Amino acid sequence: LAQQPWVEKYRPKNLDEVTAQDHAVTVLKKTLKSANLPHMLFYGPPGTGKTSTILALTKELYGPDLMKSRILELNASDERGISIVREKVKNFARLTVSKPSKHDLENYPCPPYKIIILDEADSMTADAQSALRRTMETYSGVTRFCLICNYVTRIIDPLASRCSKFRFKALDASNAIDRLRFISEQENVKCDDGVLERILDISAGDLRRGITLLQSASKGAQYLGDGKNITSTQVEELAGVVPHDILIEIVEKVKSGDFDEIKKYVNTFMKSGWSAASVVNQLHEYYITNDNFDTNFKNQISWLLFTTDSRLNNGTNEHIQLLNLLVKISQL
Amino acid sequence: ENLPWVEKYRPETLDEVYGQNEVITTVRKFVDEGKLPHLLFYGPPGTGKTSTIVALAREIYGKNYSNMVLELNASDDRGIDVVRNQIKDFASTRQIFSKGFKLIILDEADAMTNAAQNALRRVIERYTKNTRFCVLANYAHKLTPALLSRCTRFRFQPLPQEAIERRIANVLVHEKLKLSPNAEKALIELSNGDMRRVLNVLQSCKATLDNPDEDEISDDVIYECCGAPRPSDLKAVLKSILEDDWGTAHYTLNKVRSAKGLALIDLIEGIVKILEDYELQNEETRVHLLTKLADIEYSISKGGNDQIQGSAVIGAIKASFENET
Amino acid sequence: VGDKELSDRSVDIPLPFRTIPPLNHNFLPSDYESLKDKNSASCIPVRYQAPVLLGTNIKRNTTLTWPQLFKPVTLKQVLIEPKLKLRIKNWIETSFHTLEKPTEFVPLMILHGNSIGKKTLIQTIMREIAGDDNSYQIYEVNSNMNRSKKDLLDILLDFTTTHYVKSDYGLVLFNDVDVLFKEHDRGYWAMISKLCEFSRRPLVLTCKDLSLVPSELIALASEQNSLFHTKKISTSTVYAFLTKYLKSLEIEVCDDWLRDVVKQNNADIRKCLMHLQFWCVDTEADLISSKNRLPVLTSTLGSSVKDISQLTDLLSINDVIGQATLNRSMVRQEIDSTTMTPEKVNTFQDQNLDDEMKLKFDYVIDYKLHLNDPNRQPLLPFELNIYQHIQEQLEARYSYVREANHRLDNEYLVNRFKKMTESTLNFLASRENAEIDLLSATTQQIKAEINPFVFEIAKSDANVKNFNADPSIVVRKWE
Amino acid sequence: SLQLPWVEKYRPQVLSDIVGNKETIDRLQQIAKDGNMPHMIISGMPGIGKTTSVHCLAHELLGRSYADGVLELNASDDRGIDVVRNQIKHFAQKKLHLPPGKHKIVILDEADSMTAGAQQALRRTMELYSNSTRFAFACNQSNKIIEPLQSRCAILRYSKLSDEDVLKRLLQIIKLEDVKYTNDGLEAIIFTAEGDMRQAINNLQSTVAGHGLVNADNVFKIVDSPHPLIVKKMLLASNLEDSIQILRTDLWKKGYSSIDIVTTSFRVTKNLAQVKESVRLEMIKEIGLTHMRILEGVGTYLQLASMLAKIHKLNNKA
Amino acid sequence: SLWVDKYRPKSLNALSHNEELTNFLKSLSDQPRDLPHLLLYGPNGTGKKTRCMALLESIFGPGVYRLKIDVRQFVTASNRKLELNVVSSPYHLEITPSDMGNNDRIVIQELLKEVAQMRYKCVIINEANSLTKDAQAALRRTMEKYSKNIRLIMVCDSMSPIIAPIKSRCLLIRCPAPSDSEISTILSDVVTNERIQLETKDILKRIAQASNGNLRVSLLMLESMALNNELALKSSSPIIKPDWIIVIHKLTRKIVKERSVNSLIECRAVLYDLLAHCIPANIILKELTFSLLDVETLNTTNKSSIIEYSSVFDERLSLGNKAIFHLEGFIAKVMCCLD
Ligand SMILES: Nc1ncnc2c1ncn2[C@@H]1O[C@H](COP(=O)(O)OP(=O)(O)OP(O)(O)=S)[C@@H](O)[C@H]1O
Ligand SMILES: Nc1ncnc2c1ncn2[C@@H]1O[C@H](COP(=O)(O)OP(=O)(O)OP(O)(O)=S)[C@@H](O)[C@H]1O
Ligand SMILES: Nc1ncnc2c1ncn2[C@@H]1O[C@H](COP(=O)(O)OP(=O)(O)OP(O)(O)=S)[C@@H](O)[C@H]1O
Ligand SMILES: Nc1ncnc2c1ncn2[C@@H]1O[C@H](COP(=O)(O)OP(=O)(O)OP(O)(O)=S)[C@@H](O)[C@H]1O
Ligand SMILES: Nc1ncnc2c1ncn2[C@@H]1O[C@H](COP(=O)(O)OP(=O)(O)O)[C@@H](O)[C@H]1O
Ligand SMILES: [Mg+2]
Ligand SMILES: [Mg+2]
Ligand SMILES: [Mg+2]
């Protein structure tokens, strides 16, 4: 009421209002005009607009008052694949449509079958090779299930056989800039040039991450009370990204080749509090993209960086891994 | 009619079950002799265990099939107590029957627990004379060895190329579709002995055609409906990694990954499968490539960021194939 | 919709296309016989001498079970400490004297502990005080019947109110008060409360752990000093009792096997007599191996440091593999019905569930909430276990690996930490807020920094003793 | 009609015919001859002859009173708290006259599946009625039975059957059944037996029914597991490409799961004798790492390929 | 009543160092209606937990610092005595996940369900880096579904092992270690509050460098120094260290001076002595490594090998059960490389 998260406040309520994705929106509006869709999948970058797309589809298919009744949202959550998902689906299938509203007559198709949304149900402790098969075969005319995933890594071909696979392409920079600037100007966010590109680079095209970062930056600017435009440094700090000057110092230290100097600099830098994973990622970005290094050097440093990142992801001590990685880079 | 082809083209008798031959010959020997022990079909899904056993049961049980068999499922909403009660009530009854030898159709035993399996084998012990059990599973390592020792263990292997091609030839004339040779080759390569997968791909391709009467189906249509990486794209990625510079190889890999939405894993096994056909001058190249790719896949399974893993894959492949050069 | 410029092309960077030779198999019996499993020297079954039965003893040709055959008749043989026996006998006789007078005295016990003779001692006391087997009458309450209020309330009141048809040495004895069923034993603690209010005969409750009995009952028992705690007996005394029992049977036995039996049976008198009853028949067969000996141990120094370094690396990889594989089973395991599952507790919370269904699935009343992970389950014995195989292979030629297998335990280093923390709490008290704050603090930094500094402070204050008092506890715990 | 399987047709009806664990079998025979049957919990791997042993013991103890002196509680019949509280108590309270030394028998096979509460109620009714009836447990895992039951029973840890007793019993069955045998076939049967005597009998019966003469290849044609000889050649090949070819064709394309391949490779490495003990331990460690990676979820062809690469490196170098 | 305890700040304005973070926390506490999920990361002993307690005190009131101890007992499938002392308050809750081990998914889920069953109740999670992947996924699922009564505030040493969605749905707050001038100021405040007779302020500076950016270690050093000399610190009083650090230094000296198998046996005995006194293996490996790196008679390649072996065996330790095997393996590897 008082506040709405901008990730869910500015969702596209209209299917045609969704930025880009013409090849998806045209086919889905044709499908809803056909008033029937099968159990179908999505695949694309996380936060590309899958949940927003299905919400717009069921908004233009069902009624606003029927939102909380016909739609029963079971994503990858406390719901367990064989424990409470199955019983909820069954008692919802026994449940019928409530009373129709005045605006849902002759405007929205409101078909008898329900729509059940499962977000990332593949990554669950229960393998559903045929869990929903009989409950969408016997209850085909009264319910329908839509599954949402990231990649095309289908585990079981049953339960995903009659699949209308539509692809969300990666969000281009222009439309992301336009939408995020529209959100900022609706929320009177004061920012100067070069910032929005920094958020989109940090989020790597994830608009939900970008929207949350923009909201956090606006909150920080308002809490500061200065009223000045948000700078990029606050955005980097809010995302854990190490500043570029420190990365320049790190690469200078590893180019120097002195062991004691590298150890001392690592010891001083672990008191700064910056995460080592961000350091490894920025080292990868600075090294692999650069064209001033030989093929053998990049071949060795890629494996070294991968090993260090894998060790860091295993919940190990960051100082020792970072020191080993910097020393190994120096020895290259 | 307007039904999925999975249940439409089930083998009505043992003669239409292709691919598997030794088990069917053993079944024919059993029926000719008259000995029907406890059976156990397991293997990859889609090999036709359920189809083979339903054909067996129907051709033995004629018209009172609908009464004197009972098809069970361990994964339904009944529970261990309810399945035990059902088995005891169906075995200890001796209803109105022409011939005995009650048959149990118990599917998906891989989810059965140790106590449930012990109860099942004890019921098998108690009611062997009147009831025969043909519990069905898929993985043999998820079943207690006490249950394996009381059933005639029959492993099921994926269907070979000739049987799949013969069934495609049978289907196309009935459904008045036609497939190009490259399309059939790609389909049987991606099938990996999964028959239901093949039928669903065929029905999806028929539904995809604007005029499903005389339109030809290509490799692109099957590869996009099934959701499998195209060999040409992976070959292009491999050649960009090998003969091109670091920046352009990374650009091509990222562009292909974004366009086709394939995971780094499936790319790794595709690269391994393509490189296995080719030969290498040195063996240390193959050793290092396999070890590094396995480590990369293992690290990807745990989690992390994809960019450094792609860079690691490219670097490992480059180092391996410059070791031999 | 779908557009791409990429076209089908052939890769030519590697070597030209490899010709694939088929690999036929023509195995011969000369290599088939190589499948003979090599004799595994890791297994070390050692034999012991056969027992020689001396004479023809009447006790040898008995019908009753040996723990019942060697049942104590007085208060000297029941294996329990003498102070506790004297205290409980004095309480019993005082209660019998007082309850004869028409009646502030509530006869009540919690005979908690980890000993074995928690029931026969009361019977021996009854034999001593009554002087005859038929004089006393004990209503021994077990877990084999229903301990529900509506099924036993009137019976227990009638037994504790009126006389017994035949000095009426009556007593009510409650075995297995640690185990309670939520619905089968519904209203049980109400039964104890009602009996304790309306009592004229002693009530004795025996258990394993004190926490099951409600706290008000603990307070009532402690007010009358009727809370008796029993402790397990050391291996020396029980070994002496077994030797006395065997020399009463006139059977010659070696001391090593008896020591091994006592060690492996956790010094349980019933278990030891049961094992000796099973394993001392008049037969020529050898005895059980008990503790396995050294399976051709070659625990050398490893000579060069390379060999020991490789062995240590192998041990580390073994530990990693075992930690990964000992809690991942492909076969799903059943969940015990008579166990306090949080889902089962939540189900019983709902009042829609009627009595008939409640009796169908009940649980043991416990103060511990039993959680479990369906995906993460222990390995079954028939499942593949590489970790165990490599561990038994390495321990067969290196004793220090076997030492490390039991030098540190999961229960250990945790009770030690608790003891160190309570000693630190006492020291910091000896100069509330710290009581809650240090427990709020992460235990890792407690292990790291605060404890050694507390030791430094304690030893500094002890040096000048020879700002805080009583520093020797921190010194001895850190020792 | 039906033919009686040799696992049940040649089941020993007496304790003397049961091989393996000679000390425990002899002690059980002495107990049956004299009397005063103790409470024991027979524990061990399945298929080693525990249920048959306890049934033969009950037979030899009672004789004609088998039907009314033994109450058998298996997983098929309900064994809840009400069962222990009512029918076991009534059977213990039943008045059955026996010759001196004998007692009523209460057998609870697969006792590892018992609920905790049923076991808790079981200890008191077995302690109080120990003068008239005796209990006998037979469970695969001894840790599933709570401590109070083990404190009132002499736990029997039946060991795995060796090769000599299984081989001699198979020779006896072959002699009494007129089966043509060969040494390699018997060795293959023992190799696939794993001490599982029921498995060995079933394999021999299936070999006789299907392929007639019992040869090693005939035995390995019905075991429906990865071939130990093919796996041995695949592990011991001097060329890595040959090993990859073998695992791709005869193992991966034939439907053999990764778990079965890993288990067979571990068994082959354990059976190895030509290579050094340290090299064998290194291969076993590598196979354990591969099993780790499969249990984590990565049961892919690439993991087996990498395992073969490192095994081949170990064989070629060092 | 320890000095580190009794001189812990209990209000937002009482915070001395990191003035920008203090102002940020004050402005977050200005509006009590919205508290986004916070993930405080940084070096140990820099005031992350103190800052969280100060923020909770400011947003709710004085009742936050009234902490109570509740003992919760759990049993897994292996029947192990899993005990967790959940620290509770009338306004928040504190949970330490690493005290349970692998079962940090089921225990956390049960605790969150129990708390949510009863405007919002804060749950404080210490050392969030120790959470397993399934536990982190369960926490992420709790964040979205239970975003009304439960607001997760996690304090961790390192934010690297956390999953990406948790980073996405949290306000990342970094707590850098204070500069040595700020540690000197805090120690001077303690001295002028408790009247420690200092001949010079250089002692506080030396303690600040010896604490290598850790406030609690510096405070404990001041405690031990003051209680050693009885409020009479001089310059000649040496910088003392905990006994385990000294034994580790002696172990590295023995390793670098002796080359024998019996030396490895003595090292195993010393590791047994260290572990038996309940010290975690990660910090033991850290101190042992960083004292082996400070040996003057070692060249660059040997030190690089030492750091590589330390990293590899840290990887093994983070995925292992018995720390003695991994530590002995690291000792053996550096032992063979030292030849
Ligand atoms: N085309 C779009 N136009 C405007 N906003 C968009 C668009 N696509 C996504 N968003 C925003 O991004 C948010 C999250 O993206 P979605 O993919 O719709 O949700 P999601 O599927 O839950 O994301 P993930 O995969 O769970 S991270 C939405 O709530 C919108 O606010
Ligand atoms: N050898 C075969 N010949 C002809 N059709 C086959 C064959 N194997 C499978 N099929 C068909 O493929 C589909 C698979 O059906 P099922 O036999 O029920 O699958 P399954 O092999 O039992 O595996 P699951 O996943 O455990 S049901 C059916 O439409 C069968 O008719
Ligand atoms: N010296 C002894 N003192 C006490 N009991 C003995 C002694 N020697 C043998 N026993 C047997 O030990 C058993 C102890 O009594 P039980 O009733 O079986 O156990 P309990 O006292 O109920 O305690 P539990 O079994 O731990 S619940 C009896 O069967 C006795 O016959
Ligand atoms: N040593 C043996 N000598 C003779 N027959 C044996 C031997 N061991 C097992 N058998 C036979 O092998 C089969 C195994 O049956 P059981 O004894 O019931 O198996 P088990 O050892 O009790 O383990 P289970 O039943 O899987 S829990 C029976 O036919 C036995 O007669
Ligand atoms: N702003 C501050 N001013 C003075 N002392 C502080 C400040 N922040 C933290 N401290 C000191 O830190 C100690 C607590 O550290 P803590 O927050 O537990 O570290 P961590 O967050 O690493 O667990 C307190 O005793 C307090 O004296
Ligand atoms: Mg989503
Ligand atoms: Mg089926
Ligand atoms: Mg059995």
Numbering used by the authors:
A (entry chain D): 22 to 353
B (entry chain C): 11 to 335
C (entry chain A): 176 to 278, 329 to 391, 398 to 662, 699 to 733, 769 to 781
D (entry chain B): 6 to 323
E (entry chain E): 2 to 119, 134 to 354
What does the paper say about this structure?
By leveraging state-of-the-art cryo–electron microscopy (cryo-EM), we find that the architecture of Elg1-RFC is specifically suited to the unloading of PCNA. This report documents Elg1-RFC alone and Elg1-RFC bound to a closed PCNA clamp and to a cracked PCNA clamp at 3.2-, 3.3-, and 3.7-Å resolution, respectively. Because clamp unloading starts with PCNA encircling dsDNA, we propose that the three structures that we have determined represent (i) Elg1-RFC alone before it encounters a PCNA, (ii) Elg1-RFC that has taken the PCNA off DNA with the clamp being incompletely closed (i.e., cracked PCNA), and (iii) Elg1-RFC bound to the closed PCNA after PCNA is taken off DNA (Elg1-RFC–closed PCNA), respectively. The shared Elg1-RFC among the three structures is highly similar with a root mean square deviation between main chain Cα atoms in the range of 0.5 to 0.6 Å. In the cracked PCNA ring, PCNA protomers 2 and 3 are slightly uplifted toward the unloader, disrupting the β sheet interface between a PCNA interface. Clamp loader disruption of a PCNA interface is also observed in the RFC-CNA-DNA complexes, but, in those cases, the PCNA forms a wide-open ring, guided by the large RFC conformational changes, and is a presumed intermediate in clamp loading rather than unloading. Once the interface of PCNA is cracked, it likely dissociates from DNA (right). It is also possible that the Elg1-RFC AAA+ domains may interact more fully with a transient destabilized form of PCNA, leading to the cracked ring structure observed herein. Thus, after binding of Elg1-RFC to PCNA and PCNA ring cracking, the PCNA ring can only be unloaded from DNA and not loaded onto DNA.
